[PDB]
Design a protein around this ligand. Structure first.
Ligand SMILES: Cc1cc2nc3c(=O)[nH]c(=O)nc-3n(C[C@H](O)[C@H](O)[C@H](O)COP(=O)(O)O)c2cc1C
Ligand SMILES: Cc1cc2nc3c(=O)[nH]c(=O)nc-3n(C[C@H](O)[C@H](O)[C@H](O)COP(=O)(O)O)c2cc1C
Lengths: 223, 222
């Protein structure tokens, strides 16, 4: 494999996978992936990421604790919402994404109980055998969060290289106190979780094709 | 195989601080920026707006930045405050600075050499191109996280085509200058990425910045 071809395969090949098989990723592969991900750059080489990887019985207890917290409305999010977050084209993109996702799931926006069933499964990591919880410093702001994103993408691409499917999930960060309590983590903020393992390629949700805006919408070249 | 290629890309990408004058071919530049667009983001919002500057426009921009710095016209959209980094994060920052300044041959009390180096950084380290990464006006942690996902996708796509890069928060400290020179309004500047082909004879390009061990950043439980 030539480098240019490999980058295209990894970058386009990585997709948000929402249905996994139960098979675990070998421990040596997980070590190789997370070691590689640590090579992400960051402001001043600060490497602000603290990553909690959960498997087996601990992963099962964590999934049940998230389902229970969600049922009890114990929302404990570390990052507040900012008014007007998605205006204009950002809102159009979110609406189009939601439309494609629900169409692949075979659910209509008015089918509340089916949306509930789907979201309960999301808290069970879509059946993934592993989850990586991406913790950040208590004083995380835009620059540190940018580095958390550099790391998240490095990790997802290293996973893709090993045939490991992933789903980045902001949803898991909405129950940060539950994750911290389960894992014994103190004084860190939870930005997102990444469910991972091997994709169930028979699931219609994994057939969803999410477009991108393209150069004219995002990029300008000047000289 | 793909596993080896990922290792080569991820480990091969380094912050390059001395460039050759040679421009990236137009078709390669378009391929790299189109590929970077495949970065994921919350709800597929793709909040990035990227201004790629080359040639005379890049020269005018570099000179405007040098002038803004000399006149102390610092304009920051995202604060970079003292105490942003504490504990081990502050020590990693100090350790990085020590390695960089040793490669540059600049001592602690050398203000004139430090000024000359800062001027060269505002000239994009001689890179023929710079990508300015603009974010929405209301950017907070989650949107900034997506900007980082994009920035790393772009740097890795560049590395795959043998294109060296340096992500630079420094360029975001003169946000009004960048906006005025590029006709950009109502977007915040998070960082710039200088890019082109590495000058392999430059001592600064020999620096190798380590990472904390896997045991230091990651915990596995079952
Ligand atoms: C930081 C971040 C948070 C995300 N949060 C969720 C989430 O909570 N649940 C979910 O189903 N997908 C989530 N997504 C996945 C996307 O919606 C997805 O990346 C986008 O639709 C682009 O599709 P693709 O990744 O398949 O190319 C998240 C993506 C990112 C980068
Ligand atoms: C968001 C971001 C901002 C950065 N700002 C600068 C900068 O202003 N000037 C600079 O020389 N390097 C800057 N760096 C580059 C690093 O310091 C570098 O990525 C870190 O030391 C790790 O080294 P490596 O990328 O060579 O592996 C920045 C890196 C990132 C990811």
């Amino acid at each position: 494999v030539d480098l240019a071809q490999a980058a295209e395969r990894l970058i386009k090949g990585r997709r948000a996978v929402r249905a996994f098989r139960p098979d675990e990723v070998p421990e040596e592969t997980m070590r190789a992936v997370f070691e590689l991900a640590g090579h992400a750059p960051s402001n001043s080489n600060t490497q602000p990421w603290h990553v909690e990887v959960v498997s087996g019985a601990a992963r099962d207890r964590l999934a049940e604790a998230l389902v229970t917290a969600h049922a009890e409305e114990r929302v404990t999010v570390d990052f507040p919402y900012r008014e007007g977050l998605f205006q204009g084209v950002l809102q159009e993109r979110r609406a189009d994404f939601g439309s494609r996702l629900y169409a692949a799931l075979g659910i209509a926006r008015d089918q509340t109980d089916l949306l509930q069933g789907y979201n309960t499964e999301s808290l069970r990591f879509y059946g993934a055998p592993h989850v990586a919880m991406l913790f950040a410093p208590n004083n995380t702001e835009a620059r540190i969060a940018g580095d958390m994103g550099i790391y998240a993408q490095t990790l997802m691409l290293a996973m893709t290289a090993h045939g490991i499917a992933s789903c980045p999930q902001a949803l898991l960060s909405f129950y940060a106190d539950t994750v911290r309590a389960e894992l014994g983590v103190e004084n860190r903020k939870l930005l997102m979780g990444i469910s991972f393992g091997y994709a169930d390629d028979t699931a219609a949700v994994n057939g969803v094709r999410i477009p991108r805006a393209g150069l004219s919408e995002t990029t300008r070249f000047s000289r």
